[PDB]
Structure formats: C-alpha cells, structure tokens
Write a structure and sequence with these properties.
part of a larger assembly; 6 chains; A mainly alpha (205); B alpha+beta (177); C alpha+beta (146); D mainly alpha (48); E mainly beta (110); F alpha+beta (215); E: mainly beta; 0% helix; F: alpha+beta; five-stranded antiparallel sheet; 5 strands; binds magnesium ion; RNA-binding; ribonucleoprotein (chain F); Ribosomal_eL6_CS (chain F); ribosomal protein (chain F)
Chain lengths: 205, 177, 146, 48, 110, 215
RNA sequence: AAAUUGCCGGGAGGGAAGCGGAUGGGGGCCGGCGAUGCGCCCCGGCGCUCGGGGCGUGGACUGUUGUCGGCCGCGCCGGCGGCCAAAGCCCGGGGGCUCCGCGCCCCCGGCAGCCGUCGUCGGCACGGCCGGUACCCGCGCGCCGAAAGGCGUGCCCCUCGGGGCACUGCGCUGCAACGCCCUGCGGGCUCUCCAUCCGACCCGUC
RNA sequence: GUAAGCAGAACUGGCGAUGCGGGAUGAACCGGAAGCCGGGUUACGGUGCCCAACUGCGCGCUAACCUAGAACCCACAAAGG
RNA sequence: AUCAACUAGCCCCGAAAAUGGAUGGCGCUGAAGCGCGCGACCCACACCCGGCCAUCUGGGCGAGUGCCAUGCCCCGAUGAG
RNA sequence: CCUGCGCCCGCCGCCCGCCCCGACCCACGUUAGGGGCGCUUGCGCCCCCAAGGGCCCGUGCCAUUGGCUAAGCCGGUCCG
C-alpha cells in the first residue's frame, strides 16, 4: 500500500460491508500521505469471525484498566465511529507530530450526515466483504458489536437512515425521469447532426 | 515456459578395476530441477542400492526426457515413498496434466500441503500414464466425463494490469456466476 | 583455522573474490574442506574471456597492475611465450604447460555483488542454496557478478 | 529474404534413415521402464 | 469551475512526497520518494526518468518581490514495483515537505 | 554500427585516407613536409612569477548535437516551457547551434520566429508542408542578442516608460514575420482545423497520462 | 571571569530537557561578500607610459543544454548452435476397446507453417553518477564541405556493396553554446533561535 | 547432579576489546567486521498498516463457542483422547 | 453401494495464579495462518566503480636552468580496537 | 443582555494574506445474483464489467483594443 495519488479535496468512503482491518489499513496510509478522508456508515463495517469471537475480544479489552486510577487507563469507546478511529490510530504512529496531523485529517461518522448525503461516496475494493471473505465464514457488523457492548444510539442512527434513504430514493426517481428525456434528446440532436459527428463513431461506447 | 522439475536418464557405472574391465552399467529416470541436482541424486541411490559411491564411480550420460504430446491431457499415477514425523510410508497418487513434469510438480505440492512432507523426504518409486477406465482416485474420475459442465464459483476481480489499479471506485464490483 | 588457511592458499581472502583452478585429486580435496565458503564450477570461453578483459589485473613486482594493454602481459610473462591478452586467455582456458605461471600472474578477481541476488548462501547448490559445485551453472553466476 | 536454396541438402536419404532410426532407438532406451517384478510383496500395490 | 479563475494550461503532473529513502532504522535524506499521479507500475515510470520536478512553497517574507520559493529536482529511478520514484533535489527536501505536492514537468524531453 | 564505425576509424589504412597525407605527399615533392619554430617574440612586456601557461584556443572539435528522429520539417511542436508554454508551433529547421527554428505563425498564435532548445519540445505526429517556404534568411546571428550593459536598473521612472516607449523589435524583423507566415498559412489553410489547432494550447485535463498519451 | 540573579527585547511548550545527522523558516553578520581590466589600434603629449575615443575581450557564485570519455541500471529486437528436440500443422501407415470420457487411447514414417530449453553472436533506445583532457584520443600541415564527413594510389578478396592491408613524416596539443545577479526584497554562513523526520538511556569506575 | 541462567573438563569460534544490518527489545543468535564521501549491488531478514518493499501470481490444509495461529537461539508443554 | 482396523496432516480436549497486557502493536479468516513454489522488489558502515585523507610498499629527479632532498612527483595495497 | 464615546451590521475602492490549478458527479440493496424499458404485473426485450464511465469553450499571455449579440449554459444578487 503506497497511496491513491489523488488530488481530491477529500474522499468520502461509504464503509458499509468493508473489512475493519483492511479498510483501516488503506485509510491510514492515505492520511499519512496527506490526504483527507471522510468515512461514513461505520455502523455497517464488517468484521470476520462472528459476533461471539468479537464480543469476547472486546470484553477482554474492557478488562484492561489502570488499577490505581481507571480514568487514566485505557479508554474504551462504544460508538462504531470511535471504534474505527482507534483501530486506525493503532495503524498510525500517533505519538508523533506527523501522526497527530494524520489523525486530524480523518472524520468518521455513524450514518451519513450532511453534507455527505448529497456527495458521491466511493468504495475501496481492496477491503470489500464480497472480495475478501468466503461466503460461509462468520462475520458481524460493527454496529452489532457496539449495540451489545453499550452503545445507546443504535436506534437513533436507524431512525435517521430510513428517512435519509427514503429521501434519497425519490431523488433516484427524479433523476430517472430526467435521464430518459435526455436520452431521447441524444438521438434527436444526433440525427440533426449527420456526418458532422462522424469522428465520434469509432470511439463511442 | 520452464517446468520446475525435469525428468532425466542418468547412466553410470563403477570404475574399471584391475579385474572387471567391464563393470555393469546402471540407469535411472530421475526428477530434479537441473542436471547438477540430477547427477547428485543418481549417486544417492547408487550408493545405497548398488553399493557404488560417486568416488569409486563414473558418470556416462545424462539426457532430459520431454513429453511427446504436451498439447493433450494425460492421467497419471505416481508411486512414492516418503518419511513422516514418525516413520516411512508408501503412497499412491492420481494427477491430470498435459505433461508429466506438470504432474510431478503437483505431487510435491500436495505432499507439502496435505502432509507437510518436504522434497528431501520423498522418493518416487514408479511413474505411469494410467489411461482412463483404470484411474482409481475419485477426484480424477469425475473429470472423465464428456458433457462436463460447471460454473465458476470463485472468480478473481482484478484489472488486466496494475496500470489500471485505483484505490477508490464509484460503484461496487458487479459479480455473477 | 584449517578453513582459514586453505582459503589463503586458494587466494580467496575476501568475499566475492574469484580465482581459476586446475582440477586435481590434490585440488579437489582442498575444495571439499572449504566448500561451504566457496561456490565453483566449470567456466566457458565467454566467461573466461570477459573476466580477464574487464576485471583482469596483473601482478607486476607484487603490485596490482591493470591489463589495459598487451605490454603488461609481455613483461609479466614473456619468458613463457605469453605475449598478448588473447594468448593469456588461451593459456588459462585450455590448461596449458604454463597454467601455473599464467594463473598466478593474474591477481585475484574482484567481483561485484551478484546483480539479482543469491539464494540462501548457507546451503549447498544441490539443496537449492549456493555453496559447492554448480558445474556449468557457474557461467550464469559469472554474468551477474561481472 | 529472396529464397535462395537455404539449408540445402547436407546429406542423403539413407543416412537420414539411419540418423533418425538411431536417435529414435536411443529414445526407447531413455523412457524404458523397469518391470518392478523384483518386489514380490509390493507387486500388487505397484500395479505390476 | 465554469468561469473559473486560475493558471490555465497544465503542462505538469501532480506528485506527492512520501518521505526519504528508508530502512526500518536508518534514513537517507539525499533521496526522497515521490508518488506520481497516474503511474501504477515500475515500467510506467521509465517514461519519467530524468524529468525535472519543482517543490514550490511559500516563505514568510518576500524575496525578489514574491513569497514563493522553489527548489528543483529530477526523477532518478523507480522505487519498488507500484510506480514510486526516487527523487533528488539540489537540497534535501524539508522533513515537513512530506505529504505535500510537487510538480512533475516534461522539460528534459525525449 | 557504433562499433562498426569505430573499427573503421582506427584502421591504419583508413586514418591515412581520412587525414589526407596523400595530397600532402603531393605539394612538397617526394616527402612529407617539415615545420618551423614560432614564439620568437623577444618582447616580454611582463614576467609572471607563476609558471605561466597560456590561453587555450582549443583544437577539439565537438560533434554537432543530434536532432530527434521525429522532428522533421513541417511537424507541429508543443512548447513545454517558457512564456509560450503549451503553444503549438511549426518546426522549420535546425540551426547551426542545434536550436530548432520555429514559427507560430505569429498571425495565429502570437508566437514569432524564435529559437527553441530541442529539450523543451514534444513533437506531434501531424505534418505541415513547408518545402516551398524559404528560410535561409534566418540564421543564429539573427537572434544574436547584442546585449548592452547593466546600468539601466529598472526604476519607478523607467517601469512603464519602457512599455510606453517602443525602441524594441526593429522594422525589418516585423517585415520578415509577414513574409513567412503568409507563405505558411496557405498550406495550413489546406488542412481542415489546422488553423484552430495552432491557435489553441495543449493542456493536461484531469486523467491525462503522458506516458500513455500518444502524440 | 564563572556559577547564580533582575529588567528589556525575541523565540517554543499535551508527564522531562539536553544531544547526533538532514533540511526549512526566521534572525544576526559577512563588500578580498563579487569584475569591470587586458590585447590591437587613431590621435594628442611626454620606440616606453597617460588622456580621448575606435576595438575583440573579460569577472564570486550559480542555471540550462550540447558533445566526448568512464562506471552503472533498465527496455526492446534480430541471427546462429545443440537435443532423437518434441510439438501443433499437411499427408501416409501401425496396434486393441467393446457401447464404453468414444468423433477411445497408444505407436510409427514423410515435412518446408510456428515455438521450449541450454549456449552464443549482433544491433537499438532510454536513463543515473562522475569527469573535461599539458601524453590516450584530437588538430594543423592539400582540396571540397556550415559542419558531419568526403576526396588519392597499389596490392589481395569476394567479385553487388564494397571490403582488408600498404608506405609514414613533421610539429601542435586544458571541449563547448547561451544565460541570472551585481549594493538589491541579492548571494552564503561553519553563528543564534525555532520547526520537522530519522537516530538517540549518564558519565567516571570495578 | 533430579535438575539449574549449576559445578568441572576436550576441540573450534565468539564476547571481553566492536561499532554496523536483522532477530520488536538483549555481550557473545543470523549476516558482517569499519578511514571521510558520490553512485551501483548485495547478505541475514523481509514486502497489510505501524515500516522501505506486492493487499503480486499459483496449489492445497485450517474455522478455534480455549485470547485459533503466526521468528533458528527463544522464551515449553507430556502421557493420553 | 457399503463395512472394519490402522496410519499421519491441521484443528479441538488434556491445559490452573496472583496490578491491566501482550504473535512487538493494530489487526487478519480464498489470510495479513500453516506447508511448498514462481516473478519482481526492499534492505548493512559488506561487494563493485570513482574522489579525497592517512599508513605501508616500490620507484624518478647533478659534469645540476638547481632543492624547506628533512623536498616534489609516480605506482600498488591497506584503514576495528 | 450585549459597553455614550466603546462596538456592531450592510454596500463598493481596493490592497494584501490563505488554499487550489477542471481541486465537476447523492440511489438503496447483493454478489448461489442484479440493472434499465415496455406491456400479463409477471412475462419479454436489452445490459452486467469495474468511475477502465460520464460531464464541462475542455481550447484567451490567470487571459489584447472596441462594438454588437439570438437560442443555450455558468456565476452573483432579489424574492419565494
Ligand atoms: Mg510501504
Ligand atoms: Mg535492481
Ligand atoms: Mg536472502
Ligand atoms: Mg552457521
Ligand atoms: Mg554570568
Ligand atoms: Mg521574556
Ligand atoms: Mg535537533
Ligand atoms: Mg540552518
Ligand atoms: Mg555517455
Ligand atoms: Mg511420431
Ligand atoms: Mg576486563
Ligand atoms: Mg550506498
Ligand atoms: Mg612509507
Ligand atoms: Mg578497508
């Protein structure tokens, strides 16, 4: 992993059905390479090995605390966005100025808040579940783990997403109509211009 | 391209002594990754089978055996002797390959996989082209079926070359088998 | 200490130094005792020629003199009717009556680290490592250290 | 390029007979199998 | 972007600084590593071998009437398989320059 | 042929032919000439204490710079740098110093006749026909700068007056430009869109990969 | 004088600081920090040196390109040789298998389209670092040519191309073309502060 | 000697006296020994992130509801299922 | 169509300790685990090519236009403490 | 609540500083399946592999001196 090499102002990544470790590794190198990343829908991140293994792993994590001052001890986050951020922090040198700067470039959210709902959301093929996991091997959703370890905002994230997904689908239909009339325009204009568009025939698909 | 393994005839005999100006000549068919390793393994068997060491011996000829019809599919049997963690065993195998070199390469691979056996621990007794109608293993027989038909249940999603690699993509990959 | 002494006699006292040897029962039994430390094989015409032109240096009065020209050979050997670099090649390749003199004349070759790498140096060539006899395959290794 | 009699006859047919017969005879030698009828115990397992 | 304002021919390709030539315990500031936009194989970067590069930054005070400063370089050789190049500049790049952008030009053309 | 030429050059016979010791065997009869002894000055004005070593007027004769194979007259070049970066121009001929002589043409691009170093150019595939254009009036000294002194520091009085003055490009050079571009445009006017092509600049729109892009 | 302290100005700070290598930003300082002279010339006065012009030059430091060497790295393409080479391809022949993977498998003999492995020979394109000539190369001594470079005679060779050898002499012998700045908001600095990456445990002692 | 990072011997090498690369970390384990530099290439070891170098091309085995397992020395696991 | 023993790969049981906790960490499940391979690549103060400093070696310089001769120049190898 | 001599807001006159260099693009869902379009509302048709695509005067010395200007497109501003 070297880096995307892209000049985008930011890259919004829809983390649904990505693998936490593979996604975190890709995102971490991007942050080090100076890029800014937004990751949305972290409740939908997938983890290999079922819920039971992942619950056990997380409750071993709850055991670790400074015996004489637990508030100083390891800080156990419940929200999926914070689970993602600490997994990324594990893959960055975060005790240097350079790694502090890298972590600043990362924003992680549960669900798709504004303005990121009207933005195009990219996917990282190297971490997708369909390509990285063999159908029939246990996995859980990072939202599911948080629910069972004490994240009390699962339902509000669910309420908000349904209203957004409905609001996005009517927009799907509105563009669906606009796409069709534009298509008929394509023909109607492309017959108005005859040989004058001949140079495009062998390079079109 | 190259085959990792090659089949060799190796010919050799003891040194002519003040008696026996015509010592007896031996041959084997050996598998190795080059001539040098082929000659070395010849002198292994001929020390421990026919009691002639490389020192008191002489090398006569070494030739590479090639497949006659590489473009066709042959079934194969391999009789092999190997060493486990607690002894020695005899094992028989069936393979399908266009060349017998290809058949041997699979055999070493499945021994290192299914049994953790390394190449310095395997001796190939006998090799053969078992014609179909006499193949024993069930894996090899299910391919002896004209009207063979099956889907590709596993299919790699990857660009033609790394030139077209990206990190991000607009849409999810579209797969159907 | 015994391995150390033999490599001094073979004029190999630095890694990736190369020299030319005559086959002998006396010689082969010296390589058997230092084999983990050396790779060796049978050189051919191209390997013997390119080594001597490109990386050949003479031992004139205990000093390492590059064989940039033929007069160095004439003054180096001369007495043994070796006059040119091309007869110096011939003297080495077809082991001749003065192979002793024309091979001691050549200073030990100083070779590159092999372009493309080695396999495991710790094993014999037969095992898949690099030590020992690799008879004609030494020529492939010459191309990559020359 | 201009189809001069390239690689014209190096030798005659009868030599081409014995030449190709000889190498082919050396071919059966190379790929010849041992019978394996030395091993009474393993004769069935070996298939011979 | 319709009716934009800005410099309005692009004769260069964007590149980003990744750090210096490294081992896991040593660092060599004389050669920096540069990711070039759109190259994705070790054979694709033979095209850029030798091309000049410019790290353009802004200093705090004006000199010759501008705050802009530029240090020039060239692409030397590929680094790895995926299309990263070793870059050499007149001066070693700033350690804070990593994660920033460089301009890869076509000037010493072939 | 690099080595084949090299073998030919060092041939004992052929270097005799090359140097021309025949035809020097001619003048001075059945012999090869002698020489004499210069430096009979007998008039040192000074005597340096350093062990003197005089001025070099080198006899070494560096080979002329090579022209890239695809830079053939009439081909359209893209300028990669300078104030005309991106401009598409016409290649006329190589000059004596090796610099390429190019024209906008100035009617179309605004690029006059000028030298461009071959390094800063990418040759395109398209071809103009210029083998009825006359270019011998141009040579390297045409562009010879004849630069003046350092005394005219551009100062507040001088900043815009230089712009508001005109003592610059002289009358014959602007008359020259009209001669060539008038001839050039005829063959340019033959090719459709070739006039538009030169008036535009080359640009890297997003996703254009030079190592892929054929020109 | 130092330790240590106050005031003024400047700089930096998330549980040490200091340190070694890099460089970037600020400072502060550096005019031997960086040149304007030398050769032909025409006078007009004191062959030699100053006063005007005419004349070609010529200056720290640094920029780009070219061309020659040296070492290196990468990519492409072509020829030859060995093997029974086999093979696919085109033709011909040879064995059993019993409704079967069945238009089955294996085998051999001719030949004239492509394609392993091992060795070798050749050409070409790109790129990196160093160097710039007192000899090695190279130049003048003849002509042509802007310059590459070419131009002569005789013997040997195939016999196209053209090829190879020939007698050899005198001297000479630090590669170039353009730039930028020139008391400046310029150039650099081994000095000071700070930032960042990498490295980095406190010395003496047994 | 039940053994011990225990006590005593034989041959060789190392540390001590020695930096450097790797084994996360370590006096003696692996590579390798050194003037101050430029360029090239390697050894041991590696190429998901930390961390320079492929989420490279192949074939199998493993599914752990015990912290599956994952580095010569080396930081154990046995009889038995 | 099937039965019985045996055999050996990975997995599981056998498998208990005191601050909170360690395949180095995060993590990984057509692996980023295990075994065997194939292409490249990355990485030492080691090897190669070059400059420079020092050591050591071997040379050249008088009927001297000749020199800190305790000097300059040339050649080769070398450099830990 | 918001400093009676203190502050705030709006317009143009710009001048610096800052980022950038086309810094253009909203479906959900699954992948042993899905997508667009018609009519039995399920059937047909066509498409399924990568944004490897579309869009955009995309073309003027960050952009020459003046006039004119459809239809179309982009910005600021007014209102809803
Ligand atoms: Mg990396
Ligand atoms: Mg390499
Ligand atoms: Mg290795
Ligand atoms: Mg060892
Ligand atoms: Mg004091
Ligand atoms: Mg203060
Ligand atoms: Mg510091
Ligand atoms: Mg500084
Ligand atoms: Mg060169
Ligand atoms: Mg046949
Ligand atoms: Mg002591
Ligand atoms: Mg180096
Ligand atoms: Mg000495
Ligand atoms: Mg040394």
């Amino acid at each position: 992993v070297s880096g995307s090499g892209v000049c985008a102002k930011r890259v919004v990544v829809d983390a649904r059905h990505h693998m936490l470790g593979r996604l975190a590794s890709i995102v971490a190198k991007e942050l080090l390479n100076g890029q800014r990343v937004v990751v949305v829908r972290c409740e939908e991140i997938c983890m290999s090995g079922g819920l039971v293994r992942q619950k056990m792993k997380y409750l071993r994590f709850l055991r670790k605390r400074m015996n004489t001052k637990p508030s100083h001890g390891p800080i156990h986050f419940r929200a999926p966005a914070k689970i993602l951020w600490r997994t990324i922090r594990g893959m960055i040198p975060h005790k240097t100025a350079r790694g502090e700067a890298a972590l600043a470039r990362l924003k992680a959210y549960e669900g798709v808040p504004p303005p990121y709902d009207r933005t195009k959301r990219m996917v990282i093929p190297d971490a997708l579940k369909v390509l990285r996991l063999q159908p029939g091997h246990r996995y859980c959703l990072l939202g599911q783990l948080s629910k069972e370890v004490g994240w009390n905002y699962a339902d509000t994230i669910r309420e908000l997403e349904e209203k957004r997904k409905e609001k996005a689908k009517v927009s799907y239909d509105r563009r669906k109509q606009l796409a069709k009339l534009r298509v008929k325009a394509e023909k109607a204009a492309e017959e108005k211009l005859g040989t004058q568009l001949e140079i495009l025939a062998p390079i079109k698909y | 391209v190259a085959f990792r393994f090659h089949q060799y005839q190796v010919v050799g005999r003891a040194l002519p002594t003040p008696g026996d100006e015509q010592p007896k000549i031996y041959r084997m068919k050996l598998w190795a990754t080059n001539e040098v390793r082929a000659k070395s393994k010849f002198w292994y068997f001929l020390r421990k089978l026919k009691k002639v060491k490389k020192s008191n011996g002489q090398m006569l000829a070494i030739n590479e055996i090639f497949e006659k019809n590489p473009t066709t599919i042959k079934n194969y049997g391999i009789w092999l002797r190997y060493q486990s963690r607690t002894g020695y065993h005899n094992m028989y195998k069936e393979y399908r390959d266009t060349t017998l070199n290809g058949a041997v390469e699979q055999m070493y691979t499945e021994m290192a996989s299914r049994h953790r056996v390394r190449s310095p621990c395997i001796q190939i007794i006998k090799t053969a082209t078992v014609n179909f109608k006499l193949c024993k293993r069930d894996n090899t027989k299910q391919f002896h079926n004209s009207k063979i038909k099956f889907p590709l249940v596993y299919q790699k999603v990857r660009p033609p070359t790394r030139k077209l690699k990206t990190t991000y993509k607009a849409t999810r990959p579209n797969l159907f088998m | 200490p015994k391995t150390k002494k033999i490599l001094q006699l073979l004029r190999l006292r630095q890694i990736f130094n190369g020299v030319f040897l005559k086959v002998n029962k006396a010689t082969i039994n010296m390589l058997r005792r230092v084999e983990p430390y050396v790779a060796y094989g049978y050189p051919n015409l191209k390997s013997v020629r390119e080594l001597i032109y490109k990386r050949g240096y003479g031992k004139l009065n205990k000093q390492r003199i590059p064989l940039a020209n033929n007069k160095v050979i004439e003054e180096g050997l001369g007495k043994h009717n070796i006059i040119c670099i091309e007869d110096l090649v011939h003297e080495i390749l077809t082991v001749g009556p003065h192979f002793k003199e024309a091979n001691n004349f050549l200073w030990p070759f100083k070779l590159k680290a092999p372009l493309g790498g080695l396999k495991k140096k710790r094993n014999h060539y037969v095992e898949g490592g690099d030590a020992g006899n690799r008879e004609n395959y030494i020529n492939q290794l010459v191309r990559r250290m020359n | 390029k201009e189809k001069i009699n390239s690689k014209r006859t190096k030798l005659s047919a009868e030599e081409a007979s014995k030449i190709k017969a000889a190498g082919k005879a050396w071919y059966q030698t190379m790929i010849s199998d041992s019978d394996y009828t030395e091993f009474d115990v393993f004769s069935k397992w070996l298939g011979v | 972007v319709k009716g934009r304002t800005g410099q309005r021919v692009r004769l260069y390709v964007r590149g980003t600084i990744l750090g210096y030539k490294r081992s896991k315990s040593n660092q060599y500031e004389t050669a920096s590593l540069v990711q070039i936009e759109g190259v994705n194989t070790r054979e694709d970067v033979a095209w850029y071998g030798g091309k000049r590069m410019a790290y353009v930054y802004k200093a705090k005070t004006k000199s010759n009437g501008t705050h802009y400063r530029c240090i020039w370089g060239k692409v030397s050789r590929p680094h790895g398989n995926t299309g990263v190049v070793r870059a050499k500049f007149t001066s070693n790049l700033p350690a804070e320059a990593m994660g920033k952008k460089v301009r890869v030009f076509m000037y010493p053309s072939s | 042929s690099k080595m084949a030429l090299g073998i030919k050059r060092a041939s004992r016979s052929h270097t005799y032919h090359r140097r021309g010791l025949w035809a020097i065997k001619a003048k001075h009869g059945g012999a090869l000439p002698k020489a004499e002894k210069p430096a009979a000055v007998a008039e040192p004005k000074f005597y340096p204490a350093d062990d003197v070593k005089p001025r070099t007027v080198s006899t070494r004769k560096p080979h002329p710079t090579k022209l890239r194979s695809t830079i053939t007259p009439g081909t359209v070049l893209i300028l990669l740098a300078g104030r005309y970066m991106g401009k598409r121009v016409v290649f006329l001929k190589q000059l004596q110093s090796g610099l390429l002589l190019i024209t906008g043409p100035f009617k179309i691009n605004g690029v006059p006749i000028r030298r461009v170093n071959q390094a800063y150019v990418i040759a395109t595939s398209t071809k103009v026909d210029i083998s009825k254009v006359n270019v011998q009036k141009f040579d390297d000294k045409y562009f010879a700068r004849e630069k003046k002194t350092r005394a005219k520091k551009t100062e507040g009085e001088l900043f815009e007056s230089d712009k508001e003055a005109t003592k610059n490009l002289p009358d014959f050079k602007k008359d020259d430009q009209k001669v060539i571009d008038a001839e050039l445009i005829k063959a340019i006017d033959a090719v459709p869109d070739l006039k538009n092509y030169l008036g535009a600049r080359f640009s890297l729109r997003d996703g254009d990969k030079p190592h892929e892009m054929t020109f």
